Amino acid sequence: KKISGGSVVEMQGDEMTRIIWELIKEKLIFPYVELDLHSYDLGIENRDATNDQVTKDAAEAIKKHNVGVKCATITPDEKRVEEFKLKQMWKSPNGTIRNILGGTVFREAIICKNIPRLVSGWVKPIIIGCHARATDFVVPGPGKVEITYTPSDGTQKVTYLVHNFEEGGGVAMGMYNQDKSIEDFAHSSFQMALSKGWPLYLSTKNTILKKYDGRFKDIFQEIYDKQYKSQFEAQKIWYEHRLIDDMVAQAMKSEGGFIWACKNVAQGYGSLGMMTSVLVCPDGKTVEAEAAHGTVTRHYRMYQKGQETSTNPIASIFAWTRGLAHRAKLDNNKELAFFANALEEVSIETIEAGFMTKDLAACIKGLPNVQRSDYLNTFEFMDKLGENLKIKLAQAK
Amino acid sequence: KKISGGSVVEMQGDEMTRIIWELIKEKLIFPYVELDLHSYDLGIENRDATNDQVTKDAAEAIKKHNVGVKCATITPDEKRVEEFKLKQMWKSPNGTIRNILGGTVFREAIICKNIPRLVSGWVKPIIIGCHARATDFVVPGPGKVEITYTPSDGTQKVTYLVHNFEEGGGVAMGMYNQDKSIEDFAHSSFQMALSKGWPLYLSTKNTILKKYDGRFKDIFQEIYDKQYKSQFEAQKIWYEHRLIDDMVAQAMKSEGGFIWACKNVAQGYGSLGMMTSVLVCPDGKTVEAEAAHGTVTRHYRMYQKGQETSTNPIASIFAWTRGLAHRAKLDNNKELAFFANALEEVSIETIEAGFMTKDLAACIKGLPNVQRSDYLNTFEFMDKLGENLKIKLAQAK
Numbered sequence: 055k056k057i058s059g060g061s062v063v064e065m066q067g068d069e070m071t072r073i074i075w076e077l078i079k080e081k082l083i084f085p086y087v088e089l090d091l092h093s094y095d096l097g098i099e100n101r102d103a104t105n106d107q108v109t110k111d112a113a114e115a116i117k118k119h120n121v122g123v124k125c126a127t128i129t130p131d132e133k134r135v136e137e138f139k140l141k142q143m144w145k146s147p148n149g150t151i152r153n154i155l156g157g158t159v160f161r162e163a164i165i166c167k168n169i170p171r172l173v174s175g176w177v178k179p180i181i182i183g184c185h186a187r188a189t190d191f192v193v194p195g196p197g198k199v200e201i202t203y204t205p206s207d208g209t210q211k212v213t214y215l216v217h218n219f220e221e222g223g224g225v226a227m228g229m230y231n232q233d234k235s236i237e238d239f240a241h242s243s244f245q246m247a248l249s250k251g252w253p254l255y256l257s258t259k260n261t262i263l264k265k266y267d268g269r270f271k272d273i274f275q276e277i278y279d280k281q282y283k284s285q286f287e288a289q290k291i292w293y294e295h296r297l298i299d300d301m302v303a304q305a306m307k308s309e310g311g312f313i314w315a316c317k318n319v320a321q322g323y324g325s326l327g328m329m330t331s332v333l334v335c336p337d338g339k340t341v342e343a344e345a346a347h348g349t350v351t352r353h354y355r356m357y358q359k360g361q362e363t364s365t366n367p368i369a370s371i372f373a374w375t376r377g378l379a380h381r382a383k384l385d386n387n388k389e390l391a392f393f394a395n396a397l398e399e400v401s402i403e404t405i406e407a408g409f410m411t412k413d414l415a416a417c418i419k420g421l422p423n424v425q426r427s428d429y430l431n432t433f434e435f436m437d438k439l440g441e442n443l444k445i446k447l448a449q450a451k
Numbered sequence: 452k453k454i455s456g457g458s459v460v461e462m463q464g465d466e467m468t469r470i471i472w473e474l475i476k477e478k479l480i481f482p483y484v485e486l487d488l489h490s491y492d493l494g495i496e497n498r499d500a501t502n503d504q505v506t507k508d509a510a511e512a513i514k515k516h517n518v519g520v521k522c523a524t525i526t527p528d529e530k531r532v533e534e535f536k537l538k539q540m541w542k543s544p545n546g547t548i549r550n551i552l553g554g555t556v557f558r559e560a561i562i563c564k565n566i567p568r569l570v571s572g573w574v575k576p577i578i579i580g581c582h583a584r585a586t587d588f589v590v591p592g593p594g595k596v597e598i599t600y601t602p603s604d605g606t607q608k609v610t611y612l613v614h615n616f617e618e619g620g621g622v623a624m625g626m627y628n629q630d631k632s633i634e635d636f637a638h639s640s641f642q643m644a645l646s647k648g649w650p651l652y653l654s655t656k657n658t659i660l661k662k663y664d665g666r667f668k669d670i671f672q673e674i675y676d677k678q679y680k681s682q683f684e685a686q687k688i689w690y691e692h693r694l695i696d697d698m699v700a701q702a703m704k705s706e707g708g709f710i711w712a713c714k715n716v717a718q719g720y721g722s723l724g725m726m727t728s729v730l731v732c733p734d735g736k737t738v739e740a741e742a743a744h745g746t747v748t749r750h751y752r753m754y755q756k757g758q759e760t761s762t763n764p765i766a767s768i769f770a771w772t773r774g775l776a777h778r779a780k781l782d783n784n785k786e787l788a789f790f791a792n793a794l795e796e797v798s799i800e801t802i803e804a805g806f807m808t809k810d811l812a813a814c815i816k817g818l819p820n821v822q823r824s825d826y827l828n829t830f831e832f833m834d835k836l837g838e839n840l841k842i843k844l845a846q847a848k
């Protein structure tokens with residue numbers, strides 16, 4: 055029956071995912087597990103009427119229960135504020151959500167065999183973490199651009215000279231990082247490895263800045279030897295520092311299945327609707343899993359019309375299965391764990407079953423070469439994911 | 452016979468390319484064209500004995516005649532200084548060469564059909580330009596990191612605050628660019644398009660820094676409208692600004708054949724011995740064309756042994772054919788132009804002729820799966836490039 059689910063946060067979405075999000079709850083999640091949900095609407099009007107207050111009210115809950123999940127929501131813009139008669143510009147709910155949570159976002163393609171990739175060789179996805187601003191300016195004429203660090207503890211001020219613009223103008227900037235944040239990035243990176251048991255690779259460009267990587271190279275390595283190395287080395291997982299061209303070579307040469315990292319994003323070898331974006335918290339309890347794509351606006355603007363369209367759920371599903379199978383690690387539950395793990399099967403295997411959406415079929419055959427009988431629509435594809443799931447449960451337990 | 456060649460600089464190399472460089476001169480270049488060469492040895496001992504003075508003596512010549520070409524040379528390191536009993540550490544000859552020349556380096560894979568790539572769809576190579584240091588530091592404790600720009604013209608000093616480290620430490624940095632350099636990067640980028648008639652794409656990440664791109668986005672656009680736009684638009688070529696994920700998507704979706712650009716490298720879809728790296732000067736006369744790979748040390752260390760090895764010339768060749776076919780644009784020569792253009796055929800077509808080296812066959816079949824009868828060695832492959840060239844001239848003129 056419905057099975058005991060912990061307390062698993064939710065966040066309602068906007069547009070074509072707010073659709074897709076629902077059929078996932080009602081077909082693919084509710085029937086089977088019973089999670090006690092705290093479901094905090096991020097639907098734009100509610101964010102608009104209640105003026106940002108619901109976003110926080112959720113972001114503080116996810117930190118409490120330790121598992122959130124999120125539909126893709128519309129960051130208002132000029133048009134977005136104006137379309138719905140919104141009463142304000144609303145910074146991206148994530149920027150609200152994330153910075154309340156903290157943490158580091160790991161985007162992970164979910165890889166299917168029949169889906170073409172960038173590397174033909176990748177069996178497992180590379181998970182790409184990235185850390186995360188800065189101040190810059192012009193210098194319209196000659197002068198000394200010299201960054202000046204004044205200590206607040208009272209001692210000798212220490213400054214350096216970045217450059218001297220003598221002929222005319224130029225451009226110049228600062229950047230910074232707090233070791234505090236950097237250290238949350240290691241833990242988010244390390245336990246995202248341990249969550250997946252994958253090898254972690256920090257990457258840097260050493261030559262270009264030495265002390266700067268020299269913290270990032272060390273401040274992980276200062277954590278690895280210190281802590282996770284035991285849980286890494288035994289458990290077969292392990293960490294390695296690396297350099298861009300070094301790995302991004304082997305990253306092209308490998309099967310995948312490692313936790314990348316970087317410093318300052320979509321790109322990807324899969325479609326936008328394949329990418330799953332998990333915000334892992336630095337404490338390792340709390341996991342906020344949203345599909346990486348947008349609200350699939352082109353698809354919805356045709357759904358108003360009732361026109362039959364194809365919007366790929368799998369990223370939205372695998373929000374849940376990163377949330378469900380996380381709660382099960384916090385709860386040491388295998389009734390919740392095995393459910394997702396089998397849902398991720400049924401979700402992916404459905405595409406090895408030939409049942410795909412238009413965006414995937416438009417990956418394979420190309421843009422024109424797809425015909426409506428080459429794929430399944432936004433509603434049809436979802437329905438199979440129930441069909442194969444229950445048939446899977448039929449033979450599972 | 453030998454045909455009238457202008458004045459085309461040369462630079463001798465080290466190790467396995469200093470080999471490969473020669474057979475290219477003697478088989479593939481000398482017999483056919485007679486260039487009046489100013490050939491300035493960069494062989495390490497000569498750089499070591501004459502203590503950097505020959506590198507400059509060449510770098511000032513290339514700027515004079517306007518066409519250089521360069522074998523791959525060994526930047527000394529600890530081991531490299533010590534191996535040859537070198538009397539000093541020698542900064543990379545390019546850093547000497549380039550900074551004397553100035554300019555911007557455009558690496559270009561030379562693409563063959565039978566050679567696998569990153570994108571299956573690329574018919575033409577993407578040319579990736581990149582502009583080019585900086586000062587960074589730690590901040591061991593609390594304080595104000597505030598970049599401080601003092602004008603030298605005497606007016607109000609203007610500073611900004613990058614961040615305030617309050618709890619403990621962190622890391623922080625400056626960076627800069629002179630509009631002067633940035634403007635050489637446009638011209639190097641623009642005439643590298645016009646040299647090839649390819650569309651140029653600047654790329655930036657706008658959000659992350661606004662005014663900073665705001666120069667780079669403008670300072671090209673300020674040059675395009677100003678000058679090349681006529682020579683671009685008519686002549687069918689054109690410029691477009693772009694953003695990373697925007698193009699690096701379409702860059703995955705395209706045939707290739709555009710001049711990329713970036714801001715702060717090998718990577719690549721071809722082998723290291725396929726990449727050709729052309730340093731284009733901002734004045735558009737002077738072109739310093741080296742193969743992008745190294746001196747192929749693993750191959751040479753086995754060439755001392757006499758062991759029969761495979762070192763792929765094509766990058767070293769296409770140094771010349773970027774130099775030869777450049778001189779012909781400065782000289783409005785079609786006896787020199789058609790030679791290279793036909794050599795690049797014969798060089799690439801040789802690989803469509805199935806004649807390849809081990810590194811390419813090790814691209815296709817994989818590392819183990821290649822057998823010595825799957826490819827041709829360092830000497831054999833070169834020899835065909837004479838065989839097919841002369842047979843090509845037999846039917847050409």
Ligand SMILES: NC(=O)C1=CN([C@@H]2O[C@H](COP(=O)(O)OP(=O)(O)OC[C@H]3O[C@@H](n4cnc5c(N)ncnc54)[C@H](OP(=O)(O)O)[C@@H]3O)[C@@H](O)[C@H]2O)C=CC1
Pocket residue numbers: 125126127128129130134148326327328344345346347348349350351352353364365366367412413
């Ligand atoms: N917080 C979040 O998670 C994010 C939210 N957003 C929201 O989305 C809006 C902009 O995103 P949007 O323009 O939709 O970009 P998306 O890529 O999310 O979707 C719109 C376009 O991308 C393609 N696409 C994306 N996902 C799919 C899918 N699952 N199936 C088929 N096609 C897909 C579609 O191409 P085609 O239909 O031609 O196949 C469509 O033209 C913003 O207003 C923002 O609010 C955006 C990014 C992240």
Ligand SMILES: NC(=O)C1=CN([C@@H]2O[C@H](COP(=O)(O)OP(=O)(O)OC[C@H]3O[C@@H](n4cnc5c(N)ncnc54)[C@H](OP(=O)(O)O)[C@@H]3O)[C@@H](O)[C@H]2O)C=CC1
Pocket residue numbers: 522523524525526527531545723724725741742743744745746747748749750761762763764809810
């Ligand atoms: N200024 C320049 O142009 C540059 C010069 N260098 C010089 O080279 C040295 C380091 O480079 P290196 O270690 O040789 O790296 P390279 O990639 O240039 O060559 C060495 C290794 O790379 C592979 N490789 C590279 N080119 C080829 C080729 N044409 N055919 C087959 N294999 C190739 C080889 O693998 P395998 O043999 O297993 O196939 C070999 O193990 C430095 O000392 C430096 O002086 C380096 C970079 C740039």
